[model samples]
Every structure is written in C-alpha cells, then in structure tokens.
Target: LVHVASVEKGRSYEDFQKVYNAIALKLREDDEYDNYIGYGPVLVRLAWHISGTWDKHDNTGGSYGGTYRFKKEFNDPSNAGLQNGFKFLEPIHKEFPWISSGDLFSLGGVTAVQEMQGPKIPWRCGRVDTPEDTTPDNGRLPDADKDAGYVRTFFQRLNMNDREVVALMGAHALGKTHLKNSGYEGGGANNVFTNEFYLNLLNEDWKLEKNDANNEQWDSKSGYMMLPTDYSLIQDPKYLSIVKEYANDQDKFFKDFSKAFEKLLENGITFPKDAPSPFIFKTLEEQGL
Candidate 1:
C-alpha cells in the first residue's frame, strides 16, 4: 500500500509536540492511580488495542480509520480497562480538536512511552477519522489465554514477525491487569516500564495456578502475574533467546522496543516514500525531567 501523506494542513512537528506536552503533563498529574503508577501504561495499551485491530489482508480494524471513537468499538469487552486512557485523552482532543482521532490515540501512546523514561519512538501523522459504520467487528485483538504459537499466529494478521512480536510483548512490563478488567491480575510494579518482564520471565519463580477468574496465570512472589501468553516466551526456544537478550541488555531492549512499537502503531497505515520522515520526540529526561 502506498497511501500519500495525509498530514493535516498547517500542522507541523511543533503542533504535535505541543500535544505531546499536554499528555505528558497529565501523565504526571495522573500518578495517583494504580498506587501512583500513573496512566502511561494503560495509555500505551490503548494505543496498542486501537492499532492492534488492523488486518492487513482486508485493510480493516487498523488505527488508520480511528473507528474506535465509535460506540461499538469503544465498548468492546476486550477494551474494558482502556477507558482510563480514553478519559485522560478526551481533554487533549478537545483542546486540539484539529488532530484526527487515530493520530491522537497513537500519539498519546508515543508520549506515554517517552515520558515514562523509555525509548524515542518516531511517529508520523495523517490518520483520518472514519464513520461509525467503518468500525471493525470485535474479537480482532489477541487473547491473553493463548500460547506462544497462538500469539505468533495472532500477530501475523497484523504482519508482525517473531522478533517484532517479542519486542512488542515486552510492553507487558508495565501496568498490571485488573481482575475485573482482563480476567487476569497483578503484574510488574504497576507502572515501571522496563525490561523487567524479560527479567522476571527469565528469573522469577512462577507457579501455574488459576485465579479467581478461573483462568490460568503464572504467579510470582514479587506479587506479579503473567498471562499464559507471557509464560510462552520462555517455553518457546526462539522467544526465550530474545527474552534473555532483553533481560541482559536494557539499551538493546529500548532500541528494539522503540522500533517494534513504532511498527505496531503503523501496521495498516501506508505512507508514501516521500512522506515526511517520522518525528522523533525528545525524552522528558533529556528535556530535564
């Protein structure tokens, strides 16, 4: 696909940077939730769920259409816990009404990742909002109950390879799953985004047990839990190697995660070869956090 740049007229990198600041500032203020864990993790999940729906074969369910703004997509059972992120972004959208829905959803994620002291994700804009009828049917997102093979095959619809899949899943390092939210519960330190997921996978004493939701999840003394899908990383030889690599090398994880996440966000969208190159926003740390 070779879609031309749909950059909003009169908009430039500065315009998006301003939007990024608004999100970043709110993230700082929203720290009270998740026991001071903040909204960054869920925001990233929102970005992923919104973009994760894309099916390359039919060109449906992608971030390009911004259909998630529609009632049907918004109410998806799989998207239960993401309302926090949506509520947080609502004000930003109202403040910058000119930006398209797809762009706002995605940019929120990019902002969250960088603000949380993670990687520098290069982003491009131009996703236009489509009608409610254009929203994709539910069930396109991957399930947490699945295995490595299922995870691998599930992402195939989005055109993600094994390397990209593992890199993207590293995001589980942030934000714990709420029992009521995802039928899974407790993970990481609630908000620390790092290679901790890889470290835990490689080192934690995870015991297989069914939670109150009656679903199998790997529990650790760190009070963190891993979905069956997460445990698959170590069980699968190919994924295990990558897990060890990320666990041992934060710089490597950051660099690879930045690329994989950017690719995940842009799955179904197309940009012309000459489309303005991706914009790499500066980190809050670099800007003096």
Candidate 2:
C-alpha cells in the first residue's frame, strides 16, 4: 500500500475538522449560481478533471500536486468553465492555508458528493506540490464528442472499468454541458439533477439538432443535449445494458455511481484496508443551527 504521509505532521483530527467546516460554510454561501443550484456539481467536475489526468502506467500527473492552481493547467481548454469551481474554493484556501492544494482539491469533490446525497468518499492527505513541468498536457481529458468505444479506450489508459466509466459519466447528469464550456449545450434541462441523467436519456426522444452557437453536436426537445460520445453509450451494445439499468432504477444508479466514483478518485494511489472507511461529511445545512 503506497500512502502519501500526512502533510500535517502533528495536526490531529480536530485540525481537519476545521478545514471541513470552512469548506462547508463557503459552499452554503455560494448557493446562488446556476439557479441557486450551488457549487456541488462543478466541484465534483473539478475533482474529476484533476484526478482524471492520472495515467496508470507511470504515476506522473494525478491529483497529488494540485497543479490546477497553475496557469498552464488552469488554462486547459478541456477545463473550460471549471474556473468557477476554483474561484469558489479560493476563500476556503485562504482560510486554511496549510492544507495542500491536492488535499483541498480532492476534498472539494468529497464534500460535493456527500452534500448532494451521493456517497461517503474516504480521502487522505499528503499530496505535496510539484513544479510547473508536471502540468499534464491539455488533451489528456476525455472529449465530449467521441463515442463509447473511444470512451472505453480512453479510460482504459487510466485503468477504469466499464462500471466506473458509466458511473463517472452519470455525473454528467449533475451539470449541464454549457455551449461556452464544451461546445455542446444542455445535457440537463436544469443543473441540479442527480442520477436522473439516465432517466433523461431513456425518456427523451433526443432530437439530433445542433446549437447555433456550436453547430457540431445534438440537442433534444427536452432542452437536453448529448455529446457524440455520451450518445454512444446507447449505440454500443455493451454500454447500453448498464445505461438502461441505471435509467430504470435510481437506487442502482446511486449504488454504482458511489463505488465507481470512489474508484475514480482513488486511481493510481495505494491504500491499505484499515486506512479509513471514508468520511461522509454533512453539508452546513445538514449540520443544523
């Protein structure tokens, strides 16, 4: 088991508890954007994009460095609109300056998932910062325009299985594909949806129309859009079954999504069984006055 030693040499549980409190409080304050949909989805997407950079063969560019704080990484075209997530976290970073960039970024994902009623994601501290050269190339992230086979092949390099791939894409349900962000528009009519993505997929007779802003992709009458790759899940026989399964049962979707997301965040890292069970932190509102 390869665990990065805690960046906090003597810091105890209470220290981390305070960091959690700061994050929770800020999340509550920033609940105005995307129709008061809150920062949950973009935070999740931020973590995904950061960790998604990891490649299994050589442990080069995982979430450990928090390199996204750098201009080169932040300017990644694939990371368009994720600045909202980073900007959202800036105050929390100011409040708790000791937390490593890696830890803060990864923890944001953990907080978002739990707050949105997703699942308890166990996290660890100890990702030290690295130099500018460590910034991964721009195209390492998945394209919104590819197909299922492409999605499968792309993720395999990162060592994710079919279930994990599907669960990760399930996150697409949480945030809409903004035309300005991904050149595709409206995956979700509203941005605050959960596992309802699959339901939208199964129910909608998605019209393959292109947005005037970006004439490359397709949108549906329900005001939802599917990337060429997203739509491929149904076209591909293997991915279609799992997609259909989640479309039918929200519980099943949640269960699978939790497991897959945990695996996604933990990729390229080592952890022992007795490390910890993963924290399920409550949102500020959930904590009660």
Candidate 3:
C-alpha cells in the first residue's frame, strides 16, 4: 500500500514550470470569476480538497492518488462548488496533457497563491493518476460547524498538529463559503493571502448568527464572517496562542502556511532518496511577465 513518487515520463523542472506559467496566465485572464475574486481562492481550495482526503492510518486517500477526478470524489458532498476549480483547470490539463491530475491540481494552488501575492509554496511534480476504485469515501474533509476540540480531533486523522492545523486554516481567508456548497455563508472573502484570517478572528466584533443555511456562523458588523470551526481557533487557548502569533506577525504566518501546505500535499507519498528537490515557482510578477 505504499505510494512512491514517480515523475512523469520525460518531464523535468522546466516542463512543470511551463505548466505553472500557463495556469498563472489563465488565472490572470479569468478575472471575472466569482465577482473578480478570480480563480485563486477556489484553485487553492481544490488543491486542498484533493489532498485533504489522506488517511494517515492506511494512506488510502491522498494527493498521490489523483482520484478526485473520479465521480465519487467529484460528487463528494464536501466537494460541492469545487467543480468551478476543476473547470478552471480543465484547459490547462488539455494543454499539458502529460501532467498528472494530482500534480496539476496541487500545482494550481501553488500558482494561485504566488500569483495572488502569497508566499511561494515549494511544489513537487509527481502524483500518478490512481484508479477510480481508490477514491476515498466522502466526509474525509472537516466540517465547518464545529468547535475547537472537534477541529483538533478531525485534523489528527491527517497527522496535523495544532500549529499546522492553525496555519492551514489560514487558507480560509482566501475564499468565502457559498451556502449551496457547505451549508454556510457570509464571509468577506479575499483572493490575496495574508494573516487577515487571524486578525479578523481576534479583532472583529463577532456575533454568532444563523445563516440562511440554518448553520450558525460568527458574523461581524463589517460584513465579515467565521464558521464555528474558524472561530474555534480563538475559543481554545492553545489555538488562540497560535492565532495571536499569526495575527501579530504576517511573515511568520506566510512561512508557516507555506510549510504546512507543502506537507499537506505531500502526505501519504514516499519520495525516493534520490528524488529531485521540490521546485519553488516564481510568481508571474517575479518573472516580470
């Protein structure tokens, strides 16, 4: 049941970097998506959803499988609204054709983050397409309407510790929850990556209110919102400590998020001792394009 990293045939850093550039270009071109939030947030979420299914106990589900392309994973209740991200990636996949689904999906996130002015996420390029039968069952992703203890327990299955969990949740700052997708809504979402999730959590005058979906979400007068799981960070002392640290220090949050995200995507796969080092892609702006 071991999954080893295998680079696509005849592909190297330049090959993948070309693919990354294409995705970044498209992300810039598709500027009207989700009211100009662009494709960045959803792309990041897609990368996370594809990777988040990893089960540390058996390693059955992970980014290694690239199984989210299958119906079972595609139609996952937890995966509603992600079709947009998939559709966003469809043309890129068509152009490349040689990149594996998992790698493309994960790379989409990395490209989106950097293009959106976030930190560079070091990305590796090898995740073979696993069979549909290997797609893990739904519900592997965490719930939005939960507390700190629930959040802690849920991430434990993925082998993520408190710091990692907090750092990863910082991604929530990128995208808003559509009521149709996750039975939650009302967040002032942003495409740019920052420590704003921590700042909003700590500084906002949040009041718990039920959204149209009948789920309770913490809403602030400034039109920002937090799901119960998001608020859980400040509710728990341990999580609060990390939240405070991230809120006060933007650079630390970016560094921690870059590491945590790379680890999240790399879970359940064993890279060879001689494998090439992970590639840190230059942003579109970095390339001066």
Candidate 4:
C-alpha cells in the first residue's frame, strides 16, 4: 500500500531534461494535430486525468502508479480522446525507454505547459509502473455538467482547496471538449496558456444553451464557451473571488498554478528526506533552441 519514490536507476535531472526536450520538440513539429491546437492541451489533460484519479482517503489511484496505461483506466469513458495524447507520447517513450509510465505521462504535461508558454512547473521523477490490477476504476474524474458545489465536493476527494481548484481549472482555456469523447463540446481552444479562462468566465455574456450533443453549457456572444462547472466558479461566492483574483493578476495565477499543478501531479506520492529536489526544466525559448 506504500508507494515510495524511487529514482530511475542512474538517471538524474539531465536525463529527464532530455526527455522533456524531446517532448517539447515533438510538440512544435506536430503542429497539424487537432486543427493545429497541437498536443499541448491534450497532454495537459492526460496528466490531469492520470493524476486526478487519486482518492485522498485510500490513495488507490494516482500519477504514482501510472495506471492510465491499463485497459480499465485507458478505456474509461471519461478518458475518451486522450488516446491522442498517448499516441503523441509513444515515440518519446520508445526513444527513452528508461522513464517510467507515470513519470513520462506526468512529464509530458509539464513539457506541454512550458512549451505552450505557460508556467515553469517543478517536476520530480520516480513513478514506477504498477500492474493492471492496480489501475483505478473509471468515474474517478470530474464531470463537466455540474455546478460549484459539485466542483467543490469533487475536488475535495483529491484534497484540493478553493484556490487550488480554481487555479487548476484555469487550464480550461487550453482546449475544446469533444462531444464524441466527453459528451460536451466547444470552448474555443487555444494552445497558449493564460488567464483568459477566468477573464472569459467573468466578462462574457453567458447564456445557458444546449449544444449539438444536447448538453447544456454556457455560451457567449463572442463564440467562447464555459462548461457549467467552469461557470460555477463565477456562480459561487468564494470561488468567484478567487476567479477574479486570478483574472486580475496573471503572475499570481501562474505562480499559484505552478505550485498547485506540482502538488496535483505529486499527490499520493511519498518522498524520503534525501529525495532530490524537484527539477525545473527550461523551455526551448529559454535555451535558444
């Protein structure tokens, strides 16, 4: 029941940085996927889905085990459309066979966020692959159709607070949902990461309407959209306050997101006192590559 952190044998920060660079470079080259939305958003979602399975009470599922590779987890209806992310990472994993599934999945998200000009998320290694039996069942991820209370209670299972939940939801700005995948659709996808999710939520004139999928989502005159859960941030008083704060202060959002994201990915993980400090990889722009 105890999953301790174990570094890949003889591997260190530079080795993982190489993997990060490969992922980042591939992200730039694969520009035509998802109508040029690229792999960034799905990669972020993949990481979240993989890590989001953690149940704080029992700690059965999480990024630590990398269980998403199993059929039960991979075929989970909630994980529909994420196969693209797995396919995207396939070549990188083939090239660097040493990285564990959990580490690679989690690292892909970190690389995607940074490559898309988002925050520099501090990442750690050592997620050994668990057997298929260890994969958590489906329905662990949150639903998009719910309100603030649902969002609040759902994230509590993952041990997230109001600020952390709102900060993580800012990722909604990245990609549009597919009706085929998640029974929801359209949010004006973008590759770059920003505070725009909050801005759009707060500023848009939203009307609840049914989409082609027959799901009710908040729509705007400008063509942007919000899931009911997304709108809930503005609907609820406490969440609304954090949403406004993130909307007004981009730097604060970035910093908080970095911390929260690192926490989310690192959840259900136990590291000894001597474990290496988390690695902060530089983006391609920073390296002038």
Candidate 5:
C-alpha cells in the first residue's frame, strides 16, 4: 500500500474551509461532552489515533485508509473512548457526502486544533477509503505503561523524533483520561490549549499510586494523572529538554506542534509535485468566531 493521495476533483480551499466551518460550528453547539471541555479534544484524538497506526516501514496502518470505520479498527482497545469523536463526525459526514473518511477524520483534528486556538495545522486532502480487509490489526498504537525508551522507539516507526513526540504528546493538555477507556484517569487541563502540559510535567508534584483501575499512574492533588510514558518525556534527558523548552515558550510549542502534527497526519501518503501546497484555513475567530 503505497497510497498516492489525490485531491478530490474540483475540491479547493473553500470546499475544505466549508467543511472546517461545519466542524467548528458544531463544536460550539455541542457542549455536553466531558463537562464542557467539548468535542474538540477527542476529535483531535481521533485524528491522531487514526493516523498514529502508521508504520513508516511498510506503510501499513495510517490515515491513508479510513479503516477506522471498519469493525476491527473501530474496536481496537487503543480506541476505546473515541466512539464519541466518531459519532460526532457522523452528521458532518452526511452533510458533506463526498469527503472520504480519512480526510474527514484528519480534518476534524485540524479543525479542532484551530478552533481551540492551538495552531494552524496545515492539512491536505485525498485520502481514499479502504476496504475492511485493509484495516490493520490491533496493538499498533503505543502503550501508556511504557518507558522513555519505549516511547522513543515506538514513534520511530512513524518517523518522529524526540521533539516531535514531545510536542504531539502535549495534546494531553486537552482531554482527560477516562478510567474505563485507557485505564488512566484525572489528567490535567480538561480545557484550554497551551503549553500547560509541559508546565504540569515540570511543575506538578506527581505521586505514583494505583488508581481505581488498579493501574500505577502518577497522581497530583490538582486532579491530574500522568501515564508512565507521559512522565517519560521529563525523565529522559533528550525529551526533557524539549519539554522544558515548550513549557518556557508557548509560541515555540504551537509552531513546532503545528509542523509536527501536520507531518503526523500526512505520514503515509505521497503527494505529487503538482499537488497544491498545504492549505492553512482561517480560524473560526478569523471568520467572526
């Protein structure tokens, strides 16, 4: 599966911008999720989770095929709580009947980030949907219980470096860990997109204990928990420096995160030289958000 991404015929910036607005607008109205942190975080998670399966080696699981719609991919243990994110996009998919599943999933993340005032993640289209058989099997996603070495090695499969992995994991600043979902709970910053993840990592006094789920996670009185891999960024010298930098300078985090996230979403697809440059859509605020 060498996926050569082809932009949907006649689809230009406006077509995608229109889709972005639809996603952004619905996010405004749907506030019942996660105590009003809303759909933004999980939608971003969905995008990453779908794309996260990519193996740079053989180009196996990735956003190139919207196989997350298949039963096996949908039911992957790693994707336990993402159903809300998928269901949220169902109506938008109905509205824009032509966009492929891969595009929709990835685009939601781009929109979610921009709407949340995180960064302008440049996105491109043309991910064609694949058959159920094309879906990759489970265990491709990284485990939370792993160490710094595991985190470093795992992301290499996706061609990510230390800074990229640290910046991407900063997305934890958005959503919480559900006990039933990922065996972790009480993550920091239920809302707001900022360098607070790195800040929390550097500032919080984390205590290791067994949660109700019986998993050992670092807990803080601020109602926060850090996965072993989450803590790994600070424990590892290389990843720690990146974490400290992001914590000190948010603009740098946003800029680095924008580039790294765009790369993550575009991992498996090859764009022709003639393919239009990546699209940077206006934030909702730019359009009277």
Candidate 6:
C-alpha cells in the first residue's frame, strides 16, 4: 500500500506576522537613504528582479528558488545597487532568522506597495532555497535603453500582455535609475511613491537631454529623467493611449498594477482555485492586535 507523507513544518501565520512586524519596523527606521527616499522602492525592485527571471518554457528561474542569496546571483549586473536593499534587510533577517529569504524579499515588496498606498498585493509562501547553480544567468531583466517594440517583445517571453507590461513599468516612478546601476540616471525625485510616473509622462515638457555624465535620456523641466524605454510609451500611439489613461485616473493605474504585480510574482507557481486567497498582510503600525 502506498502512504502519503506528512507536510513539513513551515512558519505559522502568527510567526509570519512577527516577521512582518520586523520588516515593517526596519523600513520605518531606515528612511534616510537615497536622499530620504526610504527602503520601500528598492525592496520592490529587488523582489521584481528575483521573480522576473521566470521563463514559461521551463520552470527553472523564479522566486521559487530564492537563489539571490548566492554570490553569482547577487553579483548580477542587472542587480547593481540592490545591495542597499539587501543590507537593509540584514538586520531584520538577524532578528527573524527562521524566515526564508524568498519570503522576506517578496513580503518586502507587498509591504512597500500597501504602505505607499499603491495597492494591497496578496502574497503567499512556499518558496524553497535552492543551490547556487539554480541562479539564473544574467540579461533576463528588462533593458532601460530600448524602444516600445523591444519592450513589448522582451516581456512576451515572460508571458506578459501589453496592459501588464504598461502597468509594470509604472513602478519606474517609485525608484530612480542610478548611473552605476543602469547607466541611466535620475527619474525618481521627491519619490513620493505614487502613480506619478504617468503624471510626469503626460504633464512634463520633456526635452531629450544628456546628463552631466553625458548619457542620453529624456529630462523634464522638473528635473526628472525617463529612460528610452519609458519614453517610448508616449512615442508609440498604442502605448500612448494607456499612458494617457493612467495619467488621468490614478485608481485605474493602481488596480492594473496590483493585478499585474501579483501575476508577475506568481509566474511559475501552480495554484488551485481552492487555494486560499493570497494574504493581505498588514504593516506593523497598522496591526493593533
């Protein structure tokens, strides 16, 4: 007779709640970095980079592996400057050593979005740590210096449609492109963490300008910058329509982004409809209990 195995012990909801508190507290405390821009945006970006490696053909690269802790993955040039986010999470990891790196990284993204009033991204946990060889080779992340057609084609490999692609790029508003990080610089200033990317795309009188470092990207009179890929949204007629809609309606942007981000994070996982709804975790400050 065949016998079923018992489930392994994983974190309980209460224990995960504590981990959430630890991450939320540290994010609040570390509000001075990157010109007081805070840890929220970088954390979101880190989670994106981790999960964005998934390819539909073979279920190899994805957040399921949690391999970013390895040197090869950590040193991915596309992940440059994300060390700041890793360092920010180090103390929290020290405090909650039982939590998995995959859980913490993904939770950080969920927390940042909800805290910033973007949307409540429901998240789940099951990612297991894999060996260093599981780390994906670089060049999977999106390019900053590409056009609309290039952006669309690139995301198609990842299984994203046009709306999802547009909503995902809206995240560019939350963080800036560091010169050392992406060889492009200065998009996010003020960094208020809203749907301001669309606003800037519509309202700003953007002039194609080269920065002091002599790299080309569009610059607004407001001192913000847009990567070639970002500007392509406005330049392309089809993409321009969605950009205009997002600019006119913040609610629409939030709704679309929340769905797309959740889809992005859930890329390779197989889920049954009976599976519990994704957890909408509260920030430490928001939880009175």
lDDT of 2 by residue, 45-99 (tens): 9998888888787776778778899988899999999999999889888988888
Q: State the lDDT of candidate 6 residue by residue for 152-190, as single tens digits.
A: 898887798888888898998986778877788886644
| Predicted model with the maximum lDDT | 4
Cα displacement (angstroms), candidate 3, residue 163, comes to: 0.4
Question: lDDT by residue for model 3 over 19-127, one digit each (tens)?
Answer: 9999999999999998878999999999999999999999989999889999999999999999999999999999999999999999999999899899989999878
lDDT of 5 by residue, 1-289 (tens): 5899888888999999999999999999998788888999999999999999999889998998999999899999999999999999999999998999999999999999988889889999999998888899999998998899999999999999998999999998898888999888787546568889999999988898998988999988777788999999988999999999999999999999999999999999999889988999998889886
Q: Model 3: residues >4 Å from true position, as ranges?
A: none
Query: Candidate 4 has what TM-score?
Result: 0.99
Q: What C-alpha lDDT does candidate 3 achieve relative to the native structure?
A: 0.92
Q: Whose lDDT is higher: candidate 1's or candidate 3's?
A: 3
The digit string of per-residue lDDT tens for model 4 on 140-159 reads 99888898999999999999
Full-model lDDT, candidate 4: 0.94
lDDT of each: 0.87, 0.75, 0.92, 0.94, 0.92, 0.79
In order of listing, the candidates' clash counts read 0, 3, 0, 0, 0, 0
Cα error, residue 226 of model 4, in Å, equals 0.5
What does candidate 5 score in Cα RMSD to the true structure?
0.9
Candidate with the larger TM-score of 3 and 5: 3
lDDT of 1 by residue, 149-263 (tens): 9998998998988878888989998888899988987887556568888888878898999999999999997687899998998999999988899999999999999998898
TM-score, model 2 to reference: 0.90
The TM-score of predicted model 6 comes to 0.92
All predictions: root-mean-square deviation over Cα?
Answer: 1.4, 2.4, 0.7, 0.7, 0.9, 3.4
Task: List the candidates' TM-scores in order.
Answer: 0.96, 0.90, 0.99, 0.99, 0.98, 0.92
